Write an enzyme that holds these catalytic residues in place. Structure first.
Site, PDB file in Angstrom:
ATOM      1  N   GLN A 100      -2.819   4.179   3.665  1.00  0.00           N
ATOM      2  CA  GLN A 100      -2.786   3.924   5.100  1.00  0.00           C
ATOM      3  C   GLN A 100      -3.692   4.897   5.843  1.00  0.00           C
ATOM      4  OE1 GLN A 100      -1.088   5.868   7.726  1.00  0.00           O
ATOM      5  NE2 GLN A 100      -1.570   4.311   9.264  1.00  0.00           N
ATOM      6  N   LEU A 127       0.833  -1.188   0.000  1.00  0.00           N
ATOM      7  CA  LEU A 127       0.000   0.000   0.000  1.00  0.00           C
ATOM      8  C   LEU A 127       0.876   1.250   0.000  1.00  0.00           C
ATOM      9  CD1 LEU A 127      -3.171  -0.604   2.178  1.00  0.00           C
ATOM     10  CD2 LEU A 127      -2.855  -0.659  -0.295  1.00  0.00           C
ATOM     11  N   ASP A 128       0.241   2.409   0.127  1.00  0.00           N
ATOM     12  CA  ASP A 128       0.918   3.694   0.178  1.00  0.00           C
ATOM     13  C   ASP A 128       0.516   4.407   1.462  1.00  0.00           C
ATOM     14  OD1 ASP A 128       2.231   5.491  -2.471  1.00  0.00           O
ATOM     15  OD2 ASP A 128       1.892   6.448  -0.525  1.00  0.00           O
ATOM     16  N   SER A 129       1.168   5.543   1.728  1.00  0.00           N
ATOM     17  CA  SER A 129       0.869   6.305   2.938  1.00  0.00           C
ATOM     18  C   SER A 129      -0.543   6.878   2.903  1.00  0.00           C
ATOM     19  CB  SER A 129       1.892   7.422   3.118  1.00  0.00           C
ATOM     20  OG  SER A 129       1.876   8.298   2.009  1.00  0.00           O
TER      21      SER A 129
END
Ligand SMILES: CCCCCCCCCCCCCCCCCC(=O)OC[C@H](COP(=O)([O-])OCC(O)COP(=O)([O-])OC[C@@H](COC(=O)CCCCCCCCCCCCCCCCC)OC(=O)CCCCCCCCCCCCCCCCC)OC(=O)CCCCCCCCCCCCCCCCC
Ligand SMILES: CCCCCCCCCCCCCCCCCC(=O)OC[C@H](COP(=O)([O-])OCC[N+](C)(C)C)OC(=O)CCCCCCCCCCCCCCCCC
Ligand SMILES: CCCCCCCCCCCCCCCCCC(=O)OC[C@H](COP(=O)([O-])OCC[N+](C)(C)C)OC(=O)CCCCCCCCCCCCCCCCC
Ligand SMILES: CCCCCCCCCCCCCC(=O)SCCNC(=O)CCNC(=O)[C@@H](O)C(C)(C)COP(=O)(O)O
Ligand code: SF4
Ligand code: SF4
Ligand code: FES
Lengths: 178, 113, 119, 79, 97, 114, 208
Positions: free
Chosen positions: D42, D37-39
């Site tokens: 998140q 995933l990515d920030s």
């Protein structure tokens, strides 16, 4: 110097006569009645309305109306493709292209004025060294399509031929001031 | 007599302009004593406050006091003294008698380019 | 100052090679002397007299395109005499020049027009 | 604190997160090293927690919440 | 101007002013639309001598601003940008409305 | 190489502000679609928001990130209070613009633009 | 004497020079340059750190009393490191004078707002931010004021094109006012109206 618009110099004291005057004023509407009366005076005056289109508003020979391209009495176009009108045009509403003519004269092959871009300021007619482009006194030339207000050299020459009996008269009347 | 109106909207008339002026100038001088001696702001503000305080102490008439102060009306002079006192407090906080914080680049103020 | 001589343009000192003209010293300083007949790739003619400038401690204006600087000369370029000389020479050119500017190809490319407005 | 209910309701909202599959998700799964995933993804799960729970969550705690264990015991000792 | 005297009196009484003395509509007092040709005068520079442009070149009198102090180039009384403004006198023509 | 900060001392606090702004935009998007009658769906608006953030996501300068955050907050509150209208918010999608092809063959057929 | 040349009063030049020395020695921490033009106007160029102290001193000093902000503007000179030049023109009603305070900024160094000193600085700094992209610290409400909503770029910069990047037209398919990449039926024809001859020798820069 200066002056006061709402300050009262000293006071008019508190008199019973002044009290009765104020009571009459804000009980019987005296200022309202006098406003009514002077509005009635304007009713009984003569209206300032002219009967357009049968009557026209006054103008001056300096009036800046519809653009036109003029001619000498010989019949040749006065314009010599010198492009100062395009250089001075503050709206960039003039487009000029030119080439030597079949007799070698310096003439325009394209002279376009965008009337939707033009601001009707007369800078072209005061920058023209030979009085070729002028702003004659026609103003009743509203059209129904946006294209018709994109004048070319043929349209401007036709306007100059149409209004020459009046444009030359206006220039004769007002050229000593300029 | 006593002034009826000062002519400026929102400015109240001062019943006792002399006492207010002298306490404002005394407070301004007192807050000016905390400055460094070499502060040009302290020197100039002390000169201005001293001359104005001497004029208030010299003249007990409001009209000729206004004419001597040349700062509009005496209410305007009182308001200006308040602004000067608040300014002097801020200048003491700011400390601008220090040297130049940073010289600009060489072509920063060169015109025309 | 090895094989160089000191001259002055408006009091500003500059090193020049011997044989440098007043015009060349002035453009080394960074000011362009008015000209009509001088061209840096043609021979020196000196006829149009537009480049007349006043040397300090000298009564007669000299032609900057042809006169070489001698030593220590203070070339007053914006002086009253230089401005008067430029005005007179421009007057003499435009006396017999024809009123042909609208029908002329030198619209904004005219040295005569530009130097007329400038000097 | 209803630890089992809050735990499986956390896993429930992870199931309904669209970007991650229902296959390789685990309770000990990691968002970037494992789920990829990515920030911003998140913080999408964190704000899913926020608006599905009804209590505000700061970004300081949101940066810490990276795996479901710290999510579930964070809401456990916050509730 | 073509109003009857009864209507003029009614207008004057209703307005409180003499309307006929100051009419809103221009009838004959305006200048003729055809005017004699003018002859505009010339300015002071229209002379054939003592008129060098360098003696009246106001555009070249502009100098760069003088640097009082600079961060690279650079007992007295406290001063002001100007002497203080004198108070306006009240008008002797009409001081109050 | 020594500059004055705007709001963030380093890139971590800048990322903190970025995350807060992204959270606020994500919260706003359904309310915007409900309030002004948008043809798009709620998912498409959030994809548009994330595409904007990814377009800006290549920068490392904290001052640049802080100014981008400030501009994002201005556009955000301009969407909060109804000033940015339906046309203004639909200008992000470019439905009436033909997308320029990126391959050399079609860029050759279209014209001289590199 | 000369009817075509402005008469110049030297007393204004002396008074403004004296006041420039006065302000420069009261505030040596911030003042970088003081000049008086031949037009008799005082310009004081200061560090951006001292914008609030300088404006506050000029507003509240007894000898300054510059209680009116005439305007706040910016000039884009994109050849300096700090390309934006912020200019505050101030009017003193008590002393009947005018002053100009100059400072510098670039695209990434904001300067402090003077809304606490003058309330007109609110809208003036909003306009400066909208036109030049100069951020202002501690502004109560800093946003665009003149451009369209969602306008990208700051149009008063020198590198922003005159016609801009987008133009608006009504599309009947979407029934909207859509913005498209700009196309001009007639291109704006730029003119090279610079004479190749030097006009003013007083501003002849030295050669590089
Ligand atoms: C009661 C008053 C009735 C109106 C009246 O008599 O006004 C005249 C006259 C109006 O004065 P005025 O405003 O100075 O007249 C304008 C010019 O001075 C003079 O105006 P003018 O010279 O420009 O032209 C005037 C001319 C204008 O002529 C016309 O208008 C002819 C129209 C013909 C149509 C077919 O003639 C009239 O106005 C004559 C009176 C016509 C009254 C018509 C009333 C009925 C209208 C139709 C009803 C259906 O009345 C008076 O002076 C006093 C009125 C009260 C008298 C008691
Ligand atoms: C029926 C035929 C037609 C009649 C009317 C003809 C047309 C008149 C049109 C005039 C213009 C009106 C335009 C609209 C104006 C609206 C404003 C307005 O009217 O405001 C009202 C104004 C209001 O005044 P105001 O708005 O200034 O407020 C006053 C208060 N201050 C100023 C402090 C704010 O006046 C009244 O309300 C008064 C109404 C008339 C009262 C008359 C009393 C007379 C004495 C009574 C009897 C005493 C003796 C008793 C017997 C004794 C026997 C011994
Ligand atoms: C009703 C009136 C209608 C309009 C009449 C013509 C307008 C011009 C009158 C003259 C004028 O301007 O006078 C200035 C003057 C005003 O002057 P003033 O405002 O400078 O002050 C007067 C002086 N002090 C301060 C002392 C009061 O008007 C009057 O004096 C008239 C005052 C009002 C009189 C009538 C009050 C009652 C009205 C309603 C009752 C019904 C009346 C009958 C109606 C019949 C038909 C329906
Ligand atoms: C209805 C539709 C309307 C759409 C309106 C959209 C407005 C969008 C506003 C845009 C504001 C911004 O883009 S400011 C954010 C830019 N921030 C950065 O570039 C910071 C650096 N970015 C990164 O490091 C990126 O990798 C990340 C993923 C953003 C940070 O996460 P890392 O941790 O991995
Ligand atoms: S009147 Fe002015 S705007 Fe119109 S064509 Fe002439 S110069 Fe251009
Ligand atoms: S200024 Fe007059 S002569 Fe010159 S190009 Fe224009 S219309 Fe023709
Ligand atoms: S340039 Fe012609 S005389 Fe020198």
């Amino acid at each position: 110097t200066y002056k006061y618009v709402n300050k009262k110099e000293q006071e008019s004291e508190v008199d019973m006569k002044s009290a009765t005057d104020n009571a009459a004023r804000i009980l019987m509407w005296t200022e309202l009645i006098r406003g009514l009366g002077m509005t009635l005076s304007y009713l009984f005056r003569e209206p300032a309305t002219i009967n357009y289109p049968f009557e026209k508003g006054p103008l001056s020979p300096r009036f800046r109306g519809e653009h036109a391209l003029r001619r000498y009495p010989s019949g040749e176009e006065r314009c010599i493709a010198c492009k100062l009108c395009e250089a001075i045009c503050p709206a960039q509403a003039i487009t000029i292209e030119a080439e030597p003519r079949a007799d070698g004269s310096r003439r325009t092959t394209r002279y376009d004025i965008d009337m939707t871009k033009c601001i009707y300021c007369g800078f072209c007619q005061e920058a023209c060294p030979v009085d070729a482009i002028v702003e004659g006194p026609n103003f009743e030339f509203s059209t129904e399509t946006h294209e018709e207000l994109l004048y070319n050299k043929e349209k401007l020459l036709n306007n100059g031929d149409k209004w020459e009996a009046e444009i030359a008269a206006n220039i004769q009347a007002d050229y000593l001031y300029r | 007599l006593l002034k009826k109106t000062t002519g400026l909207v929102g400015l109240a008339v001062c019943d006792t302009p002399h006492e207010r002026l002298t306490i404002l100038y005394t407070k301004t001088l007192d807050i000016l004593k905390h400055f460094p001696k070499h502060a040009a702001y302290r020197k100039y503000t002390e000169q201005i406050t001293n001359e104005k305080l001497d004029m208030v102490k010299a003249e007990p008439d409001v009209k000729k006091l206004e004419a001597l102060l040349q700062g509009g009306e005496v209410e305007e002079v009182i308001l200006q003294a308040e602004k000067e006192l608040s300014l002097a407090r801020k200048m003491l906080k700011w400390k601008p008698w220090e040297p130049l914080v940073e010289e600009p680049p060489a072509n920063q103020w060169k015109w025309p380019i | 100052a090895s094989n160089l001589i000191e001259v002055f343009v408006d009091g500003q000192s500059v090193m020049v090679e011997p044989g440098t003209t007043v015009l060349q010293a002035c453009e080394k300083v960074g000011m362009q002397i008015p000209r009509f007949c001088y061209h840096e790739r043609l021979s020196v003619a000196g006829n149009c007299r537009m480049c007349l400038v006043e040397i300090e401690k000298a009564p007669k204006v000299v032609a900057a395109c042809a006169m070489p600087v001698m030593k220590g000369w203070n070339i007053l370029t914006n002086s009253e005499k230089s401005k008067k000389a430029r005005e007179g020479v421009m007057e003499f050119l435009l006396a017999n020049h024809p009123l042909d500017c609208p029908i002329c190809d030198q619209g904004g490319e005219c040295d005569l027009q530009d130097q007329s407005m400038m000097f | 604190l209803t630890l089992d209910g809050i735990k499986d309701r956390v896993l429930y909202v992870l199931k309904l997160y669209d970007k991650i599959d229902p296959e390789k998700l685990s309770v000990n799964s990691h968002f970037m090293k494992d789920l990829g995933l990515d920030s911003l993804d998140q913080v999408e799960i964190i704000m899913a927690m926020e608006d599905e729970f009804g209590f505000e969550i700061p970004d300081i705690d949101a940066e810490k919440l990276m795996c479901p264990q710290e999510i579930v015991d964070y809401i456990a000792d916050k509730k | 101007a073509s109003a009857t005297r009864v209507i003029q009196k009614l207008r004057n009484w209703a307005s409180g002013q003499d309307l006929q003395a100051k009419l809103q509509l221009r009838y004959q007092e305006i200048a003729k639309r055809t005017q004699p040709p003018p002859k505009l005068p010339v300015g002071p520079s229209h002379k054939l001598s003592n008129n060098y442009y360098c003696t009246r070149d106001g555009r070249r009198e502009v100098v760069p601003p003088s640097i009082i102090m600079s961060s690279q180039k650079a007992e007295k009384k406290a001063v002001t940008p100007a002497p203080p403004m004198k108070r306006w006198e009240l008008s002797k023509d009409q001081p109050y409305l | 190489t020594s500059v004055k900060p705007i709001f963030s001392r380093d890139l971590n606090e800048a990322k903190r502000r970025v995350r807060e702004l992204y959270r606020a935009w994500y919260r706003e998007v359904p309310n915007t679609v409900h309030l002004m009658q948008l043809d798009i769906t709620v998912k498409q608006g959030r994809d548009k928001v994330r595409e904007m953030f990814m377009k800006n996501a290549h920068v490392t300068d904290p001052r640049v990130v802080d100014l981008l955050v400030i501009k994002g907050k201005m556009e955000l509150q301009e969407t909060i209070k109804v000033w940015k209208q339906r046309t203004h918010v639909m200008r992000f999608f470019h439905e009436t613009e033909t997308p320029r092809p990126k391959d050399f063959l079609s860029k050759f057929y279209m014209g001289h633009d590199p | 004497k000369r009817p075509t040349v402005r008469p110049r009063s030297d007393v204004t030049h002396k008074q403004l020079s004296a006041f420039g020395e006065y302000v420069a020695e009261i505030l040596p921490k911030y003042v970088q340059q003081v000049q008086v033009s031949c037009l008799d106007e005082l310009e004081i160029c200061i560090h951006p750190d001292g914008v609030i102290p300088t404006l506050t001193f000029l507003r509240d000093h007894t000898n300054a009393q510059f209680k009116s902000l005439a305007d706040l503007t910016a000039v884009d000179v994109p050849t300096r490191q700090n390309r934006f030049e912020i200019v505050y023109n101030l009017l003193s009603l008590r002393f009947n004078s005018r002053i100009r305070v100059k400072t510098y900024a670039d695209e990434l160094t904001p300067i402090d707002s003077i809304v606490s000193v003058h309330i007109a600085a609110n809208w003036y700094e909003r306009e400066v931010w909208d036109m030049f992209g100069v951020f202002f610290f501690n502004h109560p409400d800093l946003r665009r004021i003149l451009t369209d909503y969602g306008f990208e770029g700051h149009p008063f910069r020198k590198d922003f094109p005159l016609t801009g990047y987008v133009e608006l037209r009504y599309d009947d398919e979407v029934k909207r006012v859509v913005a498209e990449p700009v196309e001009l039926a007639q291109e704006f024809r730029k003119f090279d109206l610079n004479s190749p001859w030097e006009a003013f020798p007083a501003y002849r820069q030295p050669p590089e």
